Write an enzyme that holds these catalytic residues in place. Structure first.
Site, short mmCIF file in Angstrom:
data_model
loop_
_atom_site.label_atom_id
_atom_site.label_comp_id
_atom_site.label_asym_id
_atom_site.label_seq_id
_atom_site.Cartn_x
_atom_site.Cartn_y
_atom_site.Cartn_z
CG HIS A 108 -60.30 -10.72 28.05
ND1 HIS A 108 -61.29 -9.54 28.24
CD2 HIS A 108 -59.49 -10.09 27.16
CE1 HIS A 108 -60.83 -8.58 27.65
NE2 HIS A 108 -59.80 -8.85 26.83
CB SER A 133 -52.47 -11.80 24.49
OG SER A 133 -53.46 -10.89 24.19
CD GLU A 172 -62.54 0.19 -3.76
OE1 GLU A 172 -61.57 0.65 -2.97
OE2 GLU A 172 -62.77 0.95 -4.74
CE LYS A 180 -46.80 -2.55 21.58
NZ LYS A 180 -45.40 -3.45 21.79
CG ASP A 181 -53.52 -0.79 22.50
OD1 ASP A 181 -52.71 -1.19 22.23
OD2 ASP A 181 -54.72 -1.16 22.80
C1 HEM Z 1 -63.96 -6.62 13.11
C2 HEM Z 1 -62.85 -7.67 13.37
C3 HEM Z 1 -62.18 -7.88 14.45
C4 HEM Z 1 -61.67 -7.13 15.67
C5 HEM Z 1 -62.44 -5.88 16.02
C6 HEM Z 1 -60.88 -7.92 16.39
C7 HEM Z 1 -60.23 -7.52 17.78
C8 HEM Z 1 -59.37 -8.15 18.33
C9 HEM Z 1 -58.72 -7.55 19.65
C10 HEM Z 1 -58.75 -6.41 20.49
C11 HEM Z 1 -58.05 -8.84 19.82
C12 HEM Z 1 -56.95 -8.57 21.32
C13 HEM Z 1 -55.80 -7.64 20.84
C14 HEM Z 1 -55.03 -8.12 19.88
O1 HEM Z 1 -54.55 -9.40 19.85
O2 HEM Z 1 -54.62 -7.41 19.07
C15 HEM Z 1 -58.06 -9.97 18.95
C16 HEM Z 1 -57.25 -11.01 18.98
C17 HEM Z 1 -57.15 -11.98 18.31
N1 HEM Z 1 -58.05 -12.07 17.26
FE1 HEM Z 1 -59.28 -10.60 16.39
N2 HEM Z 1 -60.49 -9.02 15.58
C18 HEM Z 1 -61.19 -9.01 14.55
C19 HEM Z 1 -61.00 -10.08 13.48
C20 HEM Z 1 -60.57 -11.10 13.70
C21 HEM Z 1 -60.38 -12.24 12.57
C22 HEM Z 1 -60.99 -11.96 11.45
C23 HEM Z 1 -59.64 -13.12 13.16
C24 HEM Z 1 -59.16 -14.37 12.35
C25 HEM Z 1 -59.52 -15.02 11.35
C26 HEM Z 1 -59.17 -12.98 14.49
C27 HEM Z 1 -58.44 -13.62 15.13
C28 HEM Z 1 -57.82 -13.14 16.24
C29 HEM Z 1 -56.70 -14.01 17.41
C30 HEM Z 1 -56.36 -15.52 16.94
C31 HEM Z 1 -56.57 -13.32 18.23
C32 HEM Z 1 -55.65 -13.61 19.38
C33 HEM Z 1 -54.33 -13.05 19.25
C34 HEM Z 1 -53.30 -13.28 20.17
O3 HEM Z 1 -53.61 -13.70 21.34
O4 HEM Z 1 -52.05 -13.18 19.84
N3 HEM Z 1 -59.62 -11.57 14.70
N4 HEM Z 1 -58.88 -9.37 18.05
C1 LIG Z 2 -65.94 -3.03 -2.44
C2 LIG Z 2 -66.44 -4.23 -3.14
C3 LIG Z 2 -66.06 -5.51 -2.43
C4 LIG Z 2 -66.24 -5.39 -0.97
C5 LIG Z 2 -65.94 -6.42 -0.19
C6 LIG Z 2 -65.51 -7.84 -0.85
O1 LIG Z 2 -65.21 -8.67 -0.02
C7 LIG Z 2 -64.32 -9.43 0.10
C8 LIG Z 2 -62.79 -9.30 0.37
C9 LIG Z 2 -61.98 -10.25 0.26
C10 LIG Z 2 -62.37 -11.43 0.01
C11 LIG Z 2 -63.55 -11.81 -0.20
C12 LIG Z 2 -64.70 -11.00 -0.10
N1 LIG Z 2 -65.37 -7.76 -2.08
C13 LIG Z 2 -65.66 -6.65 -2.88
O2 LIG Z 2 -67.76 -4.35 -3.58
C14 LIG Z 2 -67.83 -4.06 -5.17
O3 LIG Z 2 -68.70 -4.18 -5.69
N2 LIG Z 2 -66.45 -4.47 -5.47
N3 LIG Z 2 -65.93 -4.59 -6.88
C15 LIG Z 2 -66.28 -5.47 -7.69
C16 LIG Z 2 -66.41 -5.03 -9.17
C17 LIG Z 2 -66.70 -6.22 -9.93
C18 LIG Z 2 -66.81 -7.69 -9.33
C19 LIG Z 2 -66.50 -7.81 -8.17
C20 LIG Z 2 -66.40 -6.79 -7.34
C21 LIG Z 2 -65.50 -4.44 -4.59
O4 LIG Z 2 -64.28 -4.43 -4.40
#
Ligand code: HEM
Ligand SMILES: C[C@@]1(c2ccc(Oc3ccccc3)nc2)OC(=O)N(Nc2ccccc2)C1=O
Ligand SMILES: CCCCCCCCCCCCCCCCCC(=O)OC[C@H](COP(=O)([O-])OCC(O)COP(=O)([O-])OC[C@@H](COC(=O)CCCCCCCCCCCCCCCCC)OC(=O)CCCCCCCCCCCCCCCCC)OC(=O)CCCCCCCCCCCCCCCCC
Ligand SMILES: CCCCCCCCCCCCCCCCCC(=O)OC[C@H](COP(=O)([O-])OCC(O)COP(=O)([O-])OC[C@@H](COC(=O)CCCCCCCCCCCCCCCCC)OC(=O)CCCCCCCCCCCCCCCCC)OC(=O)CCCCCCCCCCCCCCCCC
Ligand SMILES: CCCCCCCCCCCCCCCC(=O)OC[C@H](COP(=O)(O)OCCN)OC(=O)CCCCCCCCCCCCCCC
Ligand SMILES: CCCCCCCCCCCCCCCCCC(=O)OC[C@H](COP(=O)(O)OCCN)OC(=O)CCCCCCCCCCCCC
Ligand SMILES: CCCCCCCCCCCCCC(=O)OC[C@H](COP(=O)(O)OCC[N+](C)(C)C)OC(=O)CCCCCCCCCCCCC
Ligand SMILES: CCCCCCCCCCCCCC(=O)OC[C@H](COP(=O)(O)OCC[N+](C)(C)C)OC(=O)CCCCCCCCCCCCC
Ligand code: HEM
Ligand SMILES: CCCCCC(=O)OC[C@H](COP(=O)([O-])OCCN)OC(=O)CCCCC
Ligand SMILES: CCCCCC(=O)OC[C@H](COP(=O)([O-])OCCN)OC(=O)CCCCC
Ligand SMILES: CCCCCC(=O)OC[C@H](COP(=O)([O-])OCCN)OC(=O)CCCCC
Ligand SMILES: [Cl-]
Lengths: 105, 49, 49, 48, 61, 377, 49
Positions: free
Chosen positions: F199, F203, F269, F225-226
């Site tokens: 914020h 965005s 998975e 939209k959400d």
């Molecule tokens: C539990 C995981 C996550 C949640 C709940 C979350 C939630 C959100 C929300 C609500 C926004 C603002 C709305 C939107 O852009 O859709 C946002 C923006 C953003 N998120 Fe996340 N996020 C998560 C994980 C991540 C991860 C793993 C990354 C990158 C490695 C990331 C990068 C970003 C970026 C760069 C923005 C800004 C996007 C823009 O302004 O265009 N987020 N996130």
């Molecule tokens: C659900 C799961 C899991 C969850 C989360 C998880 O994180 C990552 C996802 C993406 C990138 C890096 C980490 N990576 C596996 O946990 C689990 O035991 N396996 N299967 C399994 C069987 C044999 C060997 C290895 C894994 C899965 O696929």
């Protein structure tokens, strides 16, 4: 100098149309990423160029919302694209490099 | 005509022309904070009523 | 990020190398102490117990 | 192995029917509000 | 029915938020009875022999 | 006006009602709220699964069956929780891919906080998969936990310390349950700091151009939209839960865990298959484990590899092709990850692993520089 | 807190008693509907099933 120059410029005009920002009425300098050097250059723009930059970006965002483009007549022609911001940005960069060179001694 | 008017007449007459009606808006000047039309339109009714 | 290569920046690094060396001794001794690292502590005189 | 088989299929049918109702209605609510913006018109009139 | 149908629904039920909410809660009541009734009748028609309530007559006791 | 002055509602107003948002954010900006919907879905379903779950190795398998057989609607809650976890990873990868394409990583604090959120959700889902105590649960715990044994000179100690013994056993499952319970709440807290830093700037949008000239309030435009996107998330979830609840799972997990025998066809998975494929393309133990970690931690380096003078790829055709070569390459590693280690999959997986790191480190930054020169700046 | 006892305040209450009566019907029907209250629903005609 037409033979080799026009082929390079021909590939640049190809890329310009492929980039497609001209399809929203934008110019090249409208698309640059705003870092601190670019915010200062935009700040230094005269009234008319600033106001023109604002409306073109506003018109493009409106199009992007609607997933539309302008009619082909209104596309920004490659030869008519004015790099209105480049000279200001070049000076802003030149000033920052001067500060950095003084910060070294 | 004025003496005929009491509180009920104002509530009935105003609701007829204001409540849940689409307004016409005109803005000029530094109007970045002018609310969006939907928000203005939502201001023309009360969820509590 | 070439701007940090200059005479002033190498005078600045020279002023802070004694301090950073000592914060490495703090962390090294702190890591050895917190983990009871037998590989290093067998050599300290009185600690041997 | 899957005693819930029959009940899950009955729920699946109800889920599809409700989604077939709710998806176009909620879609319609989105477009209704957004129509203010989607039909907006812009004009630029700078002084000369 | 000279006035529009949607027009009369608005003046009577949707203008006030209170009656707009009452029509919804009363609508969900009657919608739930008719939707489950029709949905179950469709799931049972496709599976007319298969279900238990289609075979409970064999096992009278 | 009272929405703005109350100490508590002012936070809600400045985040969901009067928040200035770009007028042109596409459907790819919907996954942020869907990630929060997923996080709230998993907490509710998960909490109701802990009311009828026991972390005893001798009854952990049976307590899950007790849910799906005797608990009133316990099965539907159970399969929402399992499929909800997969939907969580669908939204994560689209959220990440959105940010890579459109250059949203230039928000360093938000991006880096994002990488932390990805890793904790990964750790959470891994431990969740160990709880039902099937065959893949146990051997999933065996393989992934043994990755720490690759750390030189302390690896076995970290592994045995985490296991609570010389192998995965009852002590390992009970603590994985405690971690799996609490880690989602830490994620929710970190998701708030994620939004806090966002914020500050607002965005990004598809054009990568500043949108302060054309902003609209979040309400009613992006509330509805959400809401629409959430209904589509529920549709995607309920199709799995109500028509194919085992399509994304493994059948061997319906057999109780057995430490004495490993199944022949290990298949994780789907959301781990691309990184599983990266690891085994390296036969060296420590080398393959480092390549696994770097295939994810490389996201923290993406901001430093940005060379284009434009933020978004909307106007960058050469970067677009390399971007989609990365998606198809990741789709290849996911495929190779689901196949056994044999010819020709070994060589394909090696070439795809090189292409993955080659695209991020070399090709994509060089494309951004070629594009700058083509535009003469 | 005697200040709310006056002719204006009793005109204000009279304007809002029709609305509050209806929000009671919303909550009453909503409570009966959400809980499947058999004590009341046995009397409704078509619901009986
Ligand atoms: C539990 C995981 C996550 C949640 C709940 C979350 C939630 C959100 C929300 C609500 C926004 C603002 C709305 C939107 O852009 O859709 C946002 C923006 C953003 N998120 Fe996340 N996020 C998560 C994980 C991540 C991860 C793993 C990354 C990158 C490695 C990331 C990068 C970003 C970026 C760069 C923005 C800004 C996007 C823009 O302004 O265009 N987020 N996130
Ligand atoms: C659900 C799961 C899991 C969850 C989360 C998880 O994180 C990552 C996802 C993406 C990138 C890096 C980490 N990576 C596996 O946990 C689990 O035991 N396996 N299967 C399994 C069987 C044999 C060997 C290895 C894994 C899965 O696929
Ligand atoms: C869950 C619990 C819900 C809590 C809210 C209940 C209503 C409430 O608090 O009363 C105030 C709210 C004020 O409504 P009003 O009469 O238009 O008053 C206008 C004020 O001037 C205030 O007008 P305003 O201009 O300041 O703002 C209008 C306000 C009108 O909406 C609200 O005030 C509702 C607040 C949101 C509740 C959370 C959602 C659930 O609009 C919003 O804030 C809606 C944005 C919500 C977006 C959320 C998505 C993210 O009153 C009602 O909504 C009463 C009706 C309740 C119906 C419930 C059905 C059962
Ligand atoms: C089954 C699973 C669904 C797969 C999703 C496919 C991804 C996609 O293109 O969705 C666009 C759809 C529309 O997004 P948007 O914000 O209008 O534009 C996104 C980019 O700007 C889009 O970039 P763009 O401006 O270059 O547009 C690409 C073009 C994509 O066009 C195509 O390649 C699809 C054409 C299919 C022909 C349909 C004939 C039947 O998008 C469209 O024209 C919208 C798709 C219309 C679907 C009509 C189906 C009938 O994006 C999403 O909602 C993301 C995926 C949603 C998953 C739904 C499942 C839950
Ligand atoms: C404390 C409570 C916490 C709740 C947390 C829930 C988290 C949200 C999960 C979303 C689940 C989607 C609906 C499942 C339907 C189901 O499974 O219902 C199965 C029932 C039939 O059931 P039946 O055949 O037994 O007949 C019933 C006995 N008369 O019909 C349905 O399909 C209805 C669903 C319609 C299609 C989905 C529409 C989605 C709307 C979203 C509303 C979400 C409410 C949010 C609540 C917090
Ligand atoms: C990590 C492990 C992942 C394992 C799973 C891999 C399976 C992948 C399966 C393929 C998924 C394909 C998704 C659909 C992509 C549709 C692309 C499209 O519609 O066209 C490109 C679109 C063009 O839109 P512009 O914004 O450029 O301009 C619009 C002007 N009208 O531009 C866009 O819309 C691009 C937006 C970003 C797309 C995000 C896809 C990312 C895929 C995952 C990335 C993972 C990174 C770690
Ligand atoms: C791998 C393992 C690595 C670990 C290695 C061990 C590291 C040991 C700590 C070394 C750092 C000490 C630095 C330090 O003391 O500064 C912080 C403050 C300021 O001290 P102060 O004397 O006020 O002023 C310092 C001025 N000086 C340096 C010129 C003398 O000094 C303090 O305030 C510190 C003493 C306050 C203790 C109370 C705070 C702890 C939390 C409360 C716990 C008890 C209640 C639950
Ligand atoms: C003891 C149990 C008690 C329960 C009894 C049941 C109560 C039923 C609700 C009754 C209250 C309805 C009031 C209402 O609709 O107002 C809120 C908004 C505004 O409606 P709107 O038509 O926009 O304008 C109203 C103007 N009016 C009144 C003059 C016609 O209207 C809405 O926006 C409501 C419809 C939006 C649904 C989406 C929001 C729900 C969360 C999202 C869930 C799906 C995605 C996961
Ligand atoms: C980001 C949030 C979460 C994710 C991604 C997640 C993911 C998972 C996954 C993939 C499983 C394996 C399901 C299976 O193999 O059948 C699982 C199981 C489980 N989870 Fe979660 N979970 C989350 C949060 C929670 C929370 C907050 C709780 C409790 C308060 C919880 C309680 C459980 C329990 C008791 C099980 C074992 C029952 C079962 O196997 O279905 N989870 N979780
Ligand atoms: C139990 C329900 C409590 C009431 C919540 C509610 O309806 O929010 C108000 C808005 C509609 O009112 P408005 O935005 O027209 O302002 C009218 C002011 N006169 O509705 C929305 O679209 C917000 C989305 C909320 C979904 C959770
Ligand atoms: C990052 C977490 C490190 C925790 C590793 C650990 O369990 O430490 C145990 C060893 C014990 O010392 P040792 O002489 O028995 O040596 C036994 C060798 N297994 O202490 C150490 O070696 C600490 C090393 C710290 C390096 C960062
Ligand atoms: C505040 C939480 C109330 C939950 C109580 C509850 O479990 O409701 C069950 C009854 C069932 O209706 P009944 O005709 O079987 O009657 C059976 C009598 N035991 O429905 C009701 O009576 C709902 C009453 C609501 C009052 C607030
Ligand atoms: Cl099971």
């Amino acid at each position: 100098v037409s033979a080799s120059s026009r082929w390079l410029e021909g590939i640049r005009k190809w890329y310009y149309n492929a980039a497609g920002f001209n399809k929203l009425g934008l110019m090249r300098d409208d698309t640059i990423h705003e870092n601190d050097d670019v915010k200062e250059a935009i700040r230094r723009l005269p009234e008319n160029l600033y106001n023109d930059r604002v409306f073109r970006i506003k018109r493009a965002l409106d199009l992007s919302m609607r997933q539309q483009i302008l009619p082909k007549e209104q596309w920004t022609k490659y030869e008519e694209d004015k790099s209105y911001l480049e000279p200001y940005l070049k000076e802003v960069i030149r000033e920052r490099k001067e500060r950095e060179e003084w910060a070294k001694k | 005509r004025i003496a005929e008017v009491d509180a009920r007449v104002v509530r009935e007459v105003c609701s007829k022309y204001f409540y849940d009606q689409c307004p016409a808006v005109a803005g000029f000047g530094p109007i970045e904070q002018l609310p969006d039309y939907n928000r203005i339109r939502s201001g023309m009714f009360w969820l509590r009523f | 990020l070439t701007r940090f290569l200059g005479p002033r920046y190498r005078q600045l690094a020279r002023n802070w190398v004694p301090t950073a060396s000592l914060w490495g001794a703090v962390g090294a001794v702190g890591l050895v102490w917190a983990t009871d690292w037998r590989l290093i502590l067998d050599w300290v005189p009185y600690i041997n117990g | 192995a899957e005693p819930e088989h029959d009940h899950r299929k009955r729920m699946g049918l109800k889920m599809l029917l409700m989604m077939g109702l709710l998806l176009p209605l909620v879609y319609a609510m989105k477009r209704h509000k957004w129509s203010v913006l989607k039909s907006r018109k812009l004009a630029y009139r700078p002084p000369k | 029915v000279a006035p529009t149908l949607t027009a009369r629904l608005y003046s009577l039920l949707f203008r006030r938020t209170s009656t707009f909410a009452l029509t919804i809660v009363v609508g969900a009541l009657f919608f739930e009875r008719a939707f489950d009734q029709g949905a179950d009748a469709i799931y049972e028609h496709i599976n007319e022999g298969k279900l238990w309530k289609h075979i409970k007559h064999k096992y009278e006791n | 006006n009272i929405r703005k002055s109350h100490p508590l509602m002012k936070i809600v107003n400045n985040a969901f009602i009067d928040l200035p948002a770009p007028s042109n954010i596409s459907s790819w900006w919907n996954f942020g709220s869907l990630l929060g919907i997923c996080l709230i879905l998993q907490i509710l379903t998960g909490l109701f699964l802990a009311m009828h779950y026991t972390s005893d190795t001798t009854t952990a398998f049976s307590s899950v069956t007790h849910i799906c057989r005797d608990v009133n609607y316990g099965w539907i809650i159970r399969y929402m929780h399992a499929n909800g976890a997969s939907m969580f990873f669908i939204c994560l990868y689209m959220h990440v891919g959105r940010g890579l394409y459109y250059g949203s990583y230039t928000f360093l604090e938000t991006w880096n906080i994002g990488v932390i959120l990805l890793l904790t959700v990964m750790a959470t889902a891994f431990m969740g998969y160990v709880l039902p105590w099937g065959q893949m649960s146990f051997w999933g715990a065996t393989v992934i936990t043994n990755l720490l044994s690759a750390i030189p000179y302390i690896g076995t100690n970290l592994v045995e310390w985490i296991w609570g013994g010389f192998s995965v056993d009852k002590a390992t499952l009970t603590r994985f349950f405690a971690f799996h319970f609490i880690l989602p709440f830490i994620i929710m807290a970190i998701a708030m700091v994620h939004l806090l830093f966002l914020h500050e700037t607002g965005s990004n949008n598809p054009t990568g151009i500043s949108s302060d000239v054309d902003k609209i309030p979040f309400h009613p435009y992006y509330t509805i939209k959400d809401i629409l996107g959430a209904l589509l998330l529920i549709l995607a979830l309920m199709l799995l839960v109500l028509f194919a609840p085992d399509l994304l799972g493994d059948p061997d997990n319906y057999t109780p865990a057995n430490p004495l025998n490993t199944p022949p066809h290990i298949k994780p998975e789907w959301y781990f298959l691309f990184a599983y494929a990266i690891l085994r393309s390296i036969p060296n133990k420590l080398g393959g484990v480092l390549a696994l970690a770097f295939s994810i931690l490389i996201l923290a380096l993406i901001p430093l590899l940005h060379t284009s003078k434009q933020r978004s790829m909307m106007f960058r055709p050469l970067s677009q092709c390399l971007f989609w070569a990365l998606v198809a390459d990741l789709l290849t590693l996911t495929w190779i990850g689901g196949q056994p280690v044999e010819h020709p999959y070994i060589t394909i997986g090696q070439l795809a692993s090189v292409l993955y790191f080659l695209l991020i480190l070399v090709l994509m930054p060089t494309a951004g520089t070629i594009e700058n020169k083509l535009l003469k700046w």
